Design a protein around this ligand. Structure first.
Ligand SMILES: [Mg+2]
Ligand SMILES: [Mg+2]
Ligand SMILES: [Mg+2]
Ligand SMILES: [Mg+2]
Ligand SMILES: [Mg+2]
Ligand SMILES: [Mg+2]
Ligand SMILES: [Mg+2]
Ligand SMILES: [Mg+2]
Ligand SMILES: [Mg+2]
Lengths: 127, 79, 96, 151, 206, 98
RNA sequence: AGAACCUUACCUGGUCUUGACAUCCACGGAAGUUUUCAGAGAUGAGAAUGUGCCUUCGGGAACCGUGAGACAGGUGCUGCAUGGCUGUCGUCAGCUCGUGUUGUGAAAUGUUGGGUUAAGUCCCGCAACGAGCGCAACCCUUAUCCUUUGUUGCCAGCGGUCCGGCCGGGAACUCAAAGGAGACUGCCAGUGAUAAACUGGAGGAAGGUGGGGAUGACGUCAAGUCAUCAUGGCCCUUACGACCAGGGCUACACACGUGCUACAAUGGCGCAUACAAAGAGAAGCGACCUCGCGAGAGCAAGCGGACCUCAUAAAGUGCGUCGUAGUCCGGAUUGGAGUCUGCAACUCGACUCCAUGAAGUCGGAAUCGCUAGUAAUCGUGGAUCAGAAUGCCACGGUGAAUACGU
């Protein structure tokens, strides 16, 4: 049987699977380095898998849509932590300290009337 | 530049141009329309363009075919 | 809002079906790169107030020529007066 | 900031080396909110630093930053109609914060080619001091000692 | 003064509808015209009839017009004498086969438009505004209405300057969204000046 | 075949209109997959709140257009009866097309 | 929420006077669809056809023309007569009334205090006891899960494969939206008059009004709008009205505000390449295809819309070029030659093509905004609209610094 976990980050929905086989990274029928992840947010996908005994532990298939570079990257970060239901509620207690299970409630602010974008009040003449 | 294919003019003013050729030129005609363009047949014919007060005597010349009638009557008076 | 301008508007709108719409098929297909004769362009001595995009599109109640929405068919001031009295279905205070 | 004291939120560390100090450094260098183009300049400067000086990677910029740490700073009073400057001991959180700022501001005044090179030249003359940041660090210190009166 | 209009703010929360009709954006502009056009003649015909409110709707190439009233006798009359004349001209203006309903509003003091029309009609009679406003107040807690208030605006007793001088009795929660607030604005046609008549009526909690 | 798409503006009106069509069909007939929720189009307008001046102060408006799809898979001659003209239309538009 | 005519009021001309628009009287003519001459047009003067649903014969209801008076008309005057609606102090926490008491009385008390909060929030106390407005809550949206539903959405486990969810099929899941659960200082610890509350921790996706919006008290500035409408009074009334052409609203020795694009190597230019959301669309958005360097034109499917169309989003990233200059920085201005919308682009347009390449190399005193997905930066869409956004509204991408203090 498969092991599922959702996660998302700023309107970027992801779908993580974990299986016991080889350590190859398949994302949207493409490799990890061939998913252009060279600069910042290079290893934020493997951020929840930092403090574990790994060597070459798991298969993974991940597919993310919506947002941009870091929006899709941070969706995989939170998506894998929900996909740890193979290891169930044991290893999450240590992962509570890191705060990767925390779904970030920060979303882009709506544009407001009489403001340039959400906060910036346009300037005025002297006093 | 503008008007795409074919030089757009007014109908009523074309009859005045044909009047100046067939019946012959007499005096400068007082025309309110600035929309029409100058042609080769309009060369050597006196015309007059309205511009918010009274018709200005604009003399037509060989090289004026490239521009409109409205350019030769300045609307806004200065100084 | 000056009922003579609305009388001028009712005239302007009522000429759209007669002079143009039906007989405005001329200049669309006829004036094109075909086969020229300039006699088709000499049919523009028509009254001109029939023109398809001439109207300001005034508000139907008052006759204000500003803030006219195509959806409601009313000016911005009459939108608030109407909307707060209901009348437009499924309309309420927008907040998201 | 009158009643409500802040929670001092923690940024994420540098993904390559693992230094939380360099995570703040890339943010000062960052302009127009472009972190991708920011780090490309920072890493290019750090590789040229350790190669030229012939020192280790992490402690090259650290010792260079340690030299540009300000000893003390002053605060404007404005109490009884006359402006008084009172010297105060800068905290370790604010010490490196102002240090990383004055490196970028000193590098901004140079007339060199790339931002990686001109910043690396500022890091190169941090250990032995001829640069603009080492001139910028000693400004309030000349005003200090005279202002020791007010305390 | 600046306030949110009580009727509009309570559309999403605790009002039924002033329009239940659906229409597409193509014919919406022309359809919304006919809904205000029919009310111009209908409010004139139901001026002396003391109409509270009417609900326009058009169920698939038709028209209903659900008419409430304080006085059901004058609206209905003997059989369909006054019913047929109203239904005829609505079909002509709308351009569709029109029906008609009937509805009796018990306790006319509870409605906003009925009390607003009651106060403003007395201004042409030339009676004292202090008494005219108080006659609406005097029967508040007797039959329904847990709270109520009335406001007049400008030209108080033929004065040279414009005063307000509002009055209130009971609980009128203006910004409580769950609270049932009935409201309607009205104006006077008096030759000494224009007096606006606003009345806020609170029925219950839910 | 029996593809019927609805439209309604209110936050809860069509929910009761699309309920009655289900239990009428599936009782005498069979199948009837049920009401598809469908994406809501929201036409957001903004108009000036004051009659004169006041650029900063405005009022925002919206009209939510909620769609539903019936999808009956069983065309029987019994279930087509007692479907038409027991809808009791409360201004909800109904259309019969592919 | 958009002056090329129109809009449009105002100006110089040409015109009409019971009028452009509405009621009513008398009289004639169906209305209307056809054409020609003159005029810039408003318009007069002809030749055609037509003469339709009721009518003891005086006539009708639609519309046109003529004539006479009641009138119609006014974006004209007064927001120091007004309605309606709105700015701002201010989303600041205040502002008041019943009875009672105090002072001869204006008024006070309540609502003076002691803690606490975003808050007249709550506790205790009190010569006051209560009530109401406001605040908070109820609401919309957003953070999470469950139930209900599976097309046009989605593709794990299965196979058939043109390696396209494309086609059975599977309905998990993402997305989508109806109804619910959950966050209440409640569980624990400490402090505090043992009460309110505060600090900290556990659990939890979200902890102390979660984030944001709607929601703007009593009143003030005789604040703004007689020009949206409504409306008192006043005034014009063969004119300040009405119709039409052209003009102006876009002027130019100047001053100021509000924005855009810059002065560059965190960048320019060229090739290649990856990831959005919110929309709008039938008098419309316009594939695919062909032509043109291009704006666009012709031909021309599909979809009233999770399908089809605008739509190939850009920053970013991979190589190369440029190496500090008034330059491959910047685009102004001007010339030549085009497209598009429309009766119409000259006054007075958008956009494209070739060429020209002003000023400016971080801006004096002074001044403006913002405390977290915010500042800033790079793009998209909509309303307005035939056709003109750098404005406005709406949406998303990348994404900080610093808050010791009053
Ligand atoms: Mg009028
Ligand atoms: Mg127009
Ligand atoms: Mg004009
Ligand atoms: Mg004024
Ligand atoms: Mg007091
Ligand atoms: Mg209170
Ligand atoms: Mg509130
Ligand atoms: Mg005033
Ligand atoms: Mg250039």
């Amino acid at each position: 049987n498969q092991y599922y976990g959702t996660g998302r980050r700023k309107s970027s929905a992801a779908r993580v699977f974990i299986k016991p086989g080889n350590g190859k990274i398949v994302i949207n029928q493409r490799s990890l380095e061939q998913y252009f992840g060279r600069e910042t947010a290079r290893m934020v996908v493997r951020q929840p898998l930092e403090l574990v005994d790994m060597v070459e532990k798991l298969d993974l298939y991940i597919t993310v849509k919506g947002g941009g570079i870091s929006g899709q990257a941070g969706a995989i970060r939170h998506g894998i932590t929900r996909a740890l239901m193979e290891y169930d509620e044991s290893l999450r207690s240590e992962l509570r300290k890191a705060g990767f299970v925390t779904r970030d409630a920060r979303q882009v602010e709506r544009k407001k009337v009489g403001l340039r974008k959400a906060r910036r009040r346009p300037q005025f003449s002297k006093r | 530049r503008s008007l795409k294919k074919g030089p757009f003019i007014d109908l009523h003013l074309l009859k005045k141009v044909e009047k100046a050729v067939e019946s012959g030129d007499k005096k400068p005609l007082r025309t309110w329309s600035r929309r029409s363009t100058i042609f080769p047949n309009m060369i050597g014919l006196t015309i007059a363009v309205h511009n918010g007060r009274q018709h200005v005597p604009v003399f037509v010349t060989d090289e004026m075919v490239g521009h409109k009638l409205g350019e030769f009557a300045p609307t806004r008076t200065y100084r | 809002a000056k009922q003579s301008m609305k009388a001028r508007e009712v005239k302007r709108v009522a000429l759209a079906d007669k002079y143009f719409a039906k007989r405005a098929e001329l200049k669309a297909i006829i004036s094109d790169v075909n086969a020229r004769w300039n006699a088709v362009l000499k049919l523009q001595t028509l009254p001109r107030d029939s023109s398809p995009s001439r109207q300001r599109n005034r508000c139907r109640q008052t006759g204000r020529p500003h803030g006219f929405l195509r959806k409601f068919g009313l000016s911005r001031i009459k939108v608030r007066e109407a909307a707060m009295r209901g009348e437009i279905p499924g309309l309420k205070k927008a907040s998201w | 900031p009158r009643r409500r004291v802040i929670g001092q939120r923690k940024i994420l560390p540098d993904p390559k080396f693992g230094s939380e100090l360099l995570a703040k450094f890339v943010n000062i260098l960052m302009v127009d909110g472009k972190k991708s183009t920011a780090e490309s300049i920072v890493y290019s400067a750090l590789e040229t630093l350790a190669q030229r000086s012939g020192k280790s990677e992490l402690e090259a910029f650290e010792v260079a930053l340690e030299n540009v740490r300000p000893t003390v700073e002053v605060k404007s009073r404005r109490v009884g109609g006359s402006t008084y400057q009172v010297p105060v001991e800068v905290r370790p959180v604010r010490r490196n914060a102002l240090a990383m700022r004055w490196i970028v501001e000193a590098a901004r005044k140079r007339g060199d080619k790339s931002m990686a090179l001109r910043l690396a030249n500022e890091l190169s003359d941090a250990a032995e001091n001829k640069g603009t940041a080492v001139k910028k660090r000693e400004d309030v210190h000349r005003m200090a000692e005279a202002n020791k009166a007010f305390a | 003064g600046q306030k949110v209009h009580p009727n509009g703010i309570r559309l999403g929360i605790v009002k039924p509808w002033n329009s239940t009709w659906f229409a597409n954006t193509k014919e919406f502009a022309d359809n919304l015209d006919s809904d205000f056009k029919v009310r111009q003649y209908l409010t004139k015909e139901l001026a002396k009839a003391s109409v509270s409110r009417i609900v326009i709707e058009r169920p698939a190439k038709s028209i209903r017009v659900t008419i409430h009233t304080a006085r059901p006798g004058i609206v209905i009359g003997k059989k369909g004498e006054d019913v047929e004349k109203l239904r005829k001209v609505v079909a002509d203006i709308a351009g569709v086969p029109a029906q008609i309903n009937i509805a009796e509003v018990r306790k006319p003091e509870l409605d906003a438009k009925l009390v607003a029309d009651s106060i403003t009609s007395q201004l042409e009679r030339r009676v004292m505004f202090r008494r005219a406003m108080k006659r609406a107040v005097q029967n508040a807690m007797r039959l329904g209405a847990k709270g109520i208030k009335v406001e007049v605006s400008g030209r108080l007793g033929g004065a040279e300057i414009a005063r307000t001088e509002w009055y209130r009795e009971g609980r009128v929660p203006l910004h409580t969204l769950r609270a049932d607030i009935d409201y309607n604005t009205s104006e006077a046609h008096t030759t000494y000046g224009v007096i606006g008549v606003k009345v806020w009526i609170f029925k219950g909690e839910i | 075949r029996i593809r019927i798409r609805l439209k309604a503006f209110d936050h809860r009106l069509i929910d009761q209109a699309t309920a009655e069509i289900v239990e009428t069909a599936k009782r005498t007939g069979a199948q009837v997959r049920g009401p598809i929720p469908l994406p809501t189009r929201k036409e957001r307008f903004t108009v000036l709140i004051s009659p004169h001046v006041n650029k900063d102060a405005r009022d925002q408006y919206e009209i939510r257009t909620h769609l539903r799809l019936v999808d009956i898979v069983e065309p029987t001659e019994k279930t087509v009866d007692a479907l038409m003209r027991l809808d009791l239309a409360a201004g909800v538009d109904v259309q019969i097309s592919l």
